[PDB]
Design an enzyme around this catalytic site. Structure first.
Site, PDB file in Angstrom:
ATOM      1  CB  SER A 125      38.866 -18.474  15.008  1.00  0.00           C
ATOM      2  OG  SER A 125      38.127 -17.515  14.276  1.00  0.00           O
ATOM      3  N   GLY A 128      47.725  -6.961  35.803  1.00  0.00           N
ATOM      4  CA  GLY A 128      46.318  -7.211  36.074  1.00  0.00           C
ATOM      5  C   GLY A 128      45.487  -7.254  34.804  1.00  0.00           C
ATOM      6  CG  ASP A 171      45.872  -6.326  29.607  1.00  0.00           C
ATOM      7  OD1 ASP A 171      45.467  -6.832  28.526  1.00  0.00           O
ATOM      8  OD2 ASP A 171      46.770  -6.836  30.287  1.00  0.00           O
ATOM      9  CG  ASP A 174      35.700 -23.246  15.078  1.00  0.00           C
ATOM     10  OD1 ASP A 174      34.634 -22.804  14.590  1.00  0.00           O
ATOM     11  OD2 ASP A 174      36.739 -22.537  15.196  1.00  0.00           O
ATOM     12  CG  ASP A 187      49.196  -9.899  34.609  1.00  0.00           C
ATOM     13  OD1 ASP A 187      48.593  -9.563  33.596  1.00  0.00           O
ATOM     14  OD2 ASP A 187      49.458  -9.089  35.519  1.00  0.00           O
ATOM     15  CB  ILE A 188      49.437 -11.023  28.729  1.00  0.00           C
ATOM     16  CG1 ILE A 188      49.497 -12.492  28.305  1.00  0.00           C
ATOM     17  CG2 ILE A 188      50.183 -10.268  27.620  1.00  0.00           C
ATOM     18  CD1 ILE A 188      48.647 -13.381  29.050  1.00  0.00           C
ATOM     19  N   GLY A 246      49.001  -4.610  30.561  1.00  0.00           N
ATOM     20  CA  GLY A 246      49.686  -4.128  31.743  1.00  0.00           C
ATOM     21  C   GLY A 246      49.425  -5.071  32.885  1.00  0.00           C
ATOM     22  CD  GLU A 274      36.291 -19.767  12.765  1.00  0.00           C
ATOM     23  OE1 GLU A 274      36.593 -18.588  12.495  1.00  0.00           O
ATOM     24  OE2 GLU A 274      36.773 -20.349  13.752  1.00  0.00           O
TER      25      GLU A 274
HETATM   26 CA   LIG Z   1      47.596  -8.063  32.121  1.00  0.00          CA
END
Ligand SMILES: [Ca+2]
Ligand SMILES: [Ca+2]
Lengths: 357, 357
Positions: A278, A336, A338, A82, A316-317, A334, A78
């Protein structure tokens, strides 16, 4: 289906981070509650990527210090992830790593120490530690949330990883849970995706979900923080937990986190691949450092602005879900915003252009 | 029918390498992970071909050195083949041979040492070592690929043999595989043909395929690297592995590699015939050295340009397949780009003509 990995520079390229900016004049604070880093790994890594190494300094909070355990599979993963991700992408920035005891007071004290630090003066705080918001003592949630509100008032951006165990966040109590500090409305909550990209385009970007065994991005609806005014047009759904409920939606943005399309890093001398949310907070901390450098003033608290920017600023995913507990697909990505990926992955150059007057 | 052999000069003539150029002013770096060369075989060889012997120097990487084992059937065959083919065809060039341990870090370190070498300053790096792209640790693929991206940014051409075990690349796991580094989109992947030629014309050129026991050119569709933008009009077919995905097509070009129509060379004092795609990367490295000499500047990363050049620049191979595992003819050559021979064999003088303004 074959596992792959990227250097941080490849991911920044895919997200169109603004060129010619390296975070000069900015200081990124990184909070750590265990482990440590060794200079050999950091020097080897930055040299390997051809970037001038950023100055990295450790700060002791409540007696804690930089203490690598030497195990590449332990907390050093970690700490070094980082620093390597943020440092490789904002190498002109100074990086201050705050070590604190792994207690609620230590976590809080590390945050307040970094935010108010007159020596290192960070403009950005990256956090990759957390736990279910309802597993935290209410007093601790209140104190940390106020520390984040204070950072916003001071013009300091605070980013936090949204979690690596999907919509249930590691709990088996028959309910969905979001992670804290990501759930705080004053933190830029960073979710995770599976990114398939090359230098010139993103071929595919979906929700990170590798099942119970491989992890999935945190995301959902807070049971503690009301839906923020600036998030009321994002179409955050009611909580999936019976009785439902309106609440702050997590995450705000998302980036590559799938270990199967992970980050090539050097941990305790070992070249390997690490993923998880992370990596996303430091990735976007570097983006913010570049943007701050160009603007000449820190963007500080970004959430209200991000939610009113034009859609073109984000990728957008829309495909995938972060359910690793059952077959209900709670929650699903979806069009927009989510509860798996928020607004999606930022397109760096467009975000910078939208922030310039 | 009857086995034949060509000297490297005969192949260069068949491929119409540009006359009056010998790579003067250029340095070709050659990567080796084992074996060595002896000046006696090299001096004998170059003198025998009537070319002024190029200067050949060894560079030690991670403690590895030029150490011939003396066995003409061992790694010295690779080392001496590489130097004899490239040196005989670009004798005016300086040849720097980088020896490294046969480990993932050694291979990477040899490549980055050569690419960034301020003493030898190679403009071309030839690689005839490799392995299935999906047999490599993902972190190593990421590091290697970024090293090749760096070389492209610096104007250094990197060529790699595509493999000698057909479309399955030596694996017996029910899947097809392409070799790395040839699969990197930043490398000029060199496949293999069976060439029947004389000084004035090519009588026949087909895919090199001598079955399981004799070897066949590597080629196929990467499971790791997406189809590059510059390769989207080549008509790379969907992968033959399940899911039938899209990916970087291998190889980019091809040249004589069939041992039955192989290269006459002197290995550890023994005059013999050696083939394989190992010979093709040094063959084309010499072509690039001649072109760089004429242009006065290095051509560097060639892949995007090659794929938009006029078709007359290449001799299209249309007959044969590189399947040595079964009867499915995966993959098969055909008109235009194919996963056995890429764009085909270059016509030297035409490629040079196309690269001059
Ligand atoms: Ca989305
Ligand atoms: Ca063809």
């Amino acid at each position: 289906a074959a596992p792959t990995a990227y250097t941080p520079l490849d991911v920044a390229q895919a997200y169109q981070f603004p060129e010619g900016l390296d975070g000069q004049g900015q200081c990124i604070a990184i909070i750590e509650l265990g482990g440590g880093y060794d200079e050999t790994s950091l020097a080897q890594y930055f040299a390997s990527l051809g970037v001038s190494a950023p100055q990295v300094v450790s700060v002791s909070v409540d007696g804690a210090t930089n203490q690598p355990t030497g195990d590449p599979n332990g907390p050093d993963g970690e700490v070094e992830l980082d620093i390597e991700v943020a440092g490789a992408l904002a190498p002109g920035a100074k990086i201050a790593v705050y070590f604190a005891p792994n207690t609620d007071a230590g976590f809080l004290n590390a945050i307040t120490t970094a935010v108010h630090d007159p020596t290192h003066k960070p403009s950005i705080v990256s956090i990759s530690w957390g736990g279910p918001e309802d597993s935290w003592a209410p007093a601790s949630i209140a104190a940390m949330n106020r520390a984040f509100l204070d950072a916003a008032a001071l013009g300091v951006t605070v980013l936090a990883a949204a979690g690596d165990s999907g919509s249930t966040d590691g709990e088996q109590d028959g309910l969905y849970h979001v992670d804290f500090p990501a759930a705080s409305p004053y933190v830029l909550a960073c979710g995770g995706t599976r990114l398939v990209a090359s230098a010139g385009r993103i071929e595919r970007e979906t929700v990170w979900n590798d099942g119970p065994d491989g992890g999935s991005t945190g995301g959902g609806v807070s049971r503690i923080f009301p839906l923020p005014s600036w998030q009321e047009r994002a179409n955050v759904p009611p909580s999936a937990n019976p009785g439902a409920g309106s609440g702050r939606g997590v995450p705000d943005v998302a980036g590559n986190a799938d270990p199967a399309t992970g980050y090539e890093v050097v941990i305790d001398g070992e070249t390997t691949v690490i993923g998880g949310t992370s990596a996303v907070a430091p990735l976007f901390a570097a983006l913010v450092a570049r943007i701050n450098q160009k603007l000449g003033k820190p963007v500080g608290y970004l959430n209200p602005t991000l939610y009113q920017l034009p859609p073109e600023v984000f990728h957008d995913i829309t495909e995938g879900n972060n359910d690793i507990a059952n077959r209900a697909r709670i929650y699903q990505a979806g069009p927009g915003w989510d509860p798996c990926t928020g607004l999606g992955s930022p397109i760096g150059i467009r975000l910078l252009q939208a922030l310039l007057p």
